From Swiss-Prot, chain A:
Residues 140-149 are annotated as: Interaction with the Elongin BC complex. This is Mediator of RNA polymerase II transcription subunit 8. The gene is MED8. One of its GO terms (molecular function) is ubiquitin protein ligase activity. Changing L141P: Impairs interaction with the Elongin BC complex. The chain holds residues 3 to 192 of 268 of the full protein. Component of the Mediator complex, a coactivator involved in the regulated transcription of nearly all RNA polymerase II-dependent genes. Mediator functions as a bridge to convey information from gene-specific regulatory proteins to the basal RNA polymerase II transcription machinery. Mediator is recruited to promoters by direct interactions with regulatory proteins and serves as a scaffold for the assembly of a functional preinitiation complex with RNA polymerase II and the general transcription factors. It comes from Homo sapiens (Human). Residues 1-26, 131-157 form a coiled coil.
Swiss-Prot record, chain B:
Transmembrane segments: none annotated. One of its GO terms (cellular component) is nucleoplasm. Keywords: Acetylation, Activator, Disease variant, Epilepsy, Neurodegeneration, Nucleus, Transcription, Transcription regulation. Disulfide bonds: none annotated. It comes from Homo sapiens (Human). It is found in: Nucleus. One of its GO terms (biological process) is positive regulation of transcription elongation by RNA polymerase II. The chain holds residues 6 to 59 of 117 of the full protein. The gene is MED11. This is Mediator of RNA polymerase II transcription subunit 11.
Curated annotation (Swiss-Prot), chain C:
It is found in: Nucleus. Ubiquitous. Component of the Mediator complex, a coactivator involved in the regulated transcription of nearly all RNA polymerase II-dependent genes. Mediator functions as a bridge to convey information from gene-specific regulatory proteins to the basal RNA polymerase II transcription machinery. Mediator is recruited to promoters by direct interactions with regulatory proteins and serves as a scaffold for the assembly of a functional preinitiation complex with RNA polymerase II and the general transcription factors. The chain holds residues 92 to 217 of 651 of the full protein. Belongs to the Mediator complex subunit 17 family. It comes from Homo sapiens. This is Mediator of RNA polymerase II transcription subunit 17. It comes from the Eukaryota. It is linked to Microcephaly, postnatal progressive, with seizures and brain atrophy: A disorder characterized by postnatal progressive microcephaly and severe developmental retardation associated with cerebral and cerebellar atrophy. Infants manifest swallowing difficulties leading to failure to thrive, jitteriness, poor visual fixation, truncal arching, seizures. There is no acquisition of developmental milestones and patients suffer from marked spasticity and profound retardation. Progressive microcephaly becomes evident few months after birth.
UniProtKB/Swiss-Prot annotation, chain D:
This is Mediator of RNA polymerase II transcription subunit 22. Component of the Mediator complex, a coactivator involved in the regulated transcription of nearly all RNA polymerase II-dependent genes. Mediator functions as a bridge to convey information from gene-specific regulatory proteins to the basal RNA polymerase II transcription machinery. Mediator is recruited to promoters by direct interactions with regulatory proteins and serves as a scaffold for the assembly of a functional preinitiation complex with RNA polymerase II and the general transcription factors. Belongs to the Mediator complex subunit 22 family. Component of the Mediator complex, which is composed of MED1, MED4, MED6, MED7, MED8, MED9, MED10, MED11, MED12, MED13, MED13L, MED14, MED15, MED16, MED17, MED18, MED19, MED20, MED21, MED22, MED23, MED24, MED25, MED26, MED27, MED29, MED30, MED31, CCNC, CDK8 and CDC2L6/CDK11. The MED12, MED13, CCNC and CDK8 subunits form a distinct module termed the CDK8 module. Mediator containing the CDK8 module is less active than Mediator lacking this module in supporting transcriptional activation. It is found in: Nucleus. It comes from Homo sapiens. It comes from the Eukaryota.
Length: 181, 54, 117, 91
């Protein structure tokens, strides 16, 4: 029951890996082989699609129809000094040698060093007024976005120079004597 | 024979005014207080229908 | 390749974490060497976790949208303020013609009345 | 034929019309608010911003594409006209 509920999310989460590899491996060879003929819209479209579809798919497989983000247990159990061929079978040759420290390195839950200063900023902007004025600002801005989508939803919804009848009247008027008396 | 190049200049140099129309829409939008909501709405409607007359 | 160097390693930065995610989710799915246990615990937030994130996220989204709009807005204003000026001479002084993708013109007196192949 | 070129220009004009509306719709479609159901919302806002950034650049490049495709027909119209062609020859 629950294990299949984990599986139906994680299988597609690792299916997103295939699309990400198909993007990046092609990018690696096409950057080296085709550095010239610079086309900024061509790479901007690739960046736009990578931002669009991958970031939506991993989010929709990690934020809904998924096990809770604080529930499961990430457990490393086997590690050896020599190369464990199971990982190179799974990762298709990636993460080589299978060192002792690379298994703690795999669970790199520590963020970037600049994350410490942005957390310091998150403790710094709370020194001034917070969740009292900005709360009503984002409430009024949510109502403003409702007004904008209402505006969008209310905004989302030859001469006959030739005359065949007159031409057929002209071709018949001079044919015989009608319309002269 | 300069009439159609004048029409093309009307197509081109309107787009600066279109940029200013979008800017005047969004700056009045990000304002917390908007007494002239009619000005904002007519800026948006003018930007919508003016690309259409272009 | 001396250019495009930091973009390559910064793409491997996203590559490695996503590979680790793939490896751990392919070893979670296998029942061997893995312990499955539903641990339903709740972490209390000290602040309104959806609302306090909404304090900054939509504000930065709208601000960055306006900034990246204004990035390309001023780029095209100076890019438009002579190519077609001389192109209106050859239509009037001489004979103009277009074929395929290239503009050409004849020189014979066929227009002036000369039967010369 | 000539009608094929006319239909190609009409099709690309209608594609230019469609692209602008498709760019403006998805910016405000993604701005709606939804309740969280096991989401861990810390990663969604930066995703929405980074997807808004490319959508506005899509409008910018759509305007650039309009500027280029107008100039594409500018040289097409300039080669075959009759405002003063039969008039300026005899003047």
């Amino acid at each position: 029951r629950e294990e299949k509920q984990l599986e139906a999310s994680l299988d597609a989460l690792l299916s997103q890996v295939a699309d990400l590899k198909n993007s990046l491996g092609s990018f690696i060879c096409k950057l080296e082989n085709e550095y010239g003929r610079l086309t900024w819209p061509s790479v901007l479209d690739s960046f736009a699609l990578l931002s669009g579809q991958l970031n939506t798919l991993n989010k929709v497989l990690k934020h809904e129809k998924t096990p809770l983000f604080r529930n499961q247990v990430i457990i490393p159990l086997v590690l050896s000094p020599d190369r464990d061929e199971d990982l190179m079978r799974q990762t298709e040759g990636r993460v080589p040698v299978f060192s002792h420290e690379v298994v703690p390195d795999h669970l790199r839950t520590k963020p970037d060093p600049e994350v410490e200063e942005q957390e310091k900023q998150l403790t710094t902007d709370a020194a001034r007024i917070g969740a009292d004025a900005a709360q009503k600002q984002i409430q009024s801005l949510n109502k403003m976005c409702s007004n904008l989508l209402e505006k969008i939803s209310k905004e989302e919804r030859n001469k006959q120079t030739f005359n065949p009848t007159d031409t057929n009247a002209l071709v018949a008027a001079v044919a015989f004597g009608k319309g002269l008396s | 024979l300069a009439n159609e190049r004048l029409r093309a200049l009307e197509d081109i140099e309107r787009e600066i005014g279109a940029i200013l129309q979008n800017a005047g829409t969004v700056i009045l939008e990000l304002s917390k207080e908007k007494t002239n909501e009619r000005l904002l709405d007519r800026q948006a409607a003018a930007f919508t229908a003016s690309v259409q007359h272009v | 390749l001396w250019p495009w160097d930091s973009v390559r390693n910064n793409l491997r930065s996203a590559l490695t974490e996503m590979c680790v995610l793939y490896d751990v989710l392919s070893i979670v799915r296998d029942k061997k060497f893995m312990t499955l246990d539903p641990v339903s615990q709740d972490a209390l937030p000290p602040k309104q976790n959806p609302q306090t994130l909404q304090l900054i996220s939509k504000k930065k989204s709208l601000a960055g949208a306006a900034q990246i709009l204004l990035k390309g807005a001023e780029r095209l204003t100076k890019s438009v303020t002579d190519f077609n000026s001389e192109l209106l001479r050859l239509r009037q002084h001489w004979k103009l013609r277009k074929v395929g993708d290239k503009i050409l013109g004849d020189l014979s007196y066929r227009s002036a009345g000369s039967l010369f192949p | 034929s000539k009608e094929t070129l006319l239909q190609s220009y009409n099709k690309r004009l209608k594609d230019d019309i469609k692209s602008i509306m498709d760019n403006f719709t998805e910016i405000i479609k993604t701005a709606k608010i939804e309740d969280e159901t096991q989401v861990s919302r810390a990663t969604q806002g930066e995703q929405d911003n980074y997807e808004m950034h490319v959508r506005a650049a899509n409008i910018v490049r759509a305007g650039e594409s309009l500027m280029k495709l107008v100039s594409d027909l500018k040289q097409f119209l300039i080669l075959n006209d009759f405002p003063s062609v039969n008039e300026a020859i005899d003047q």
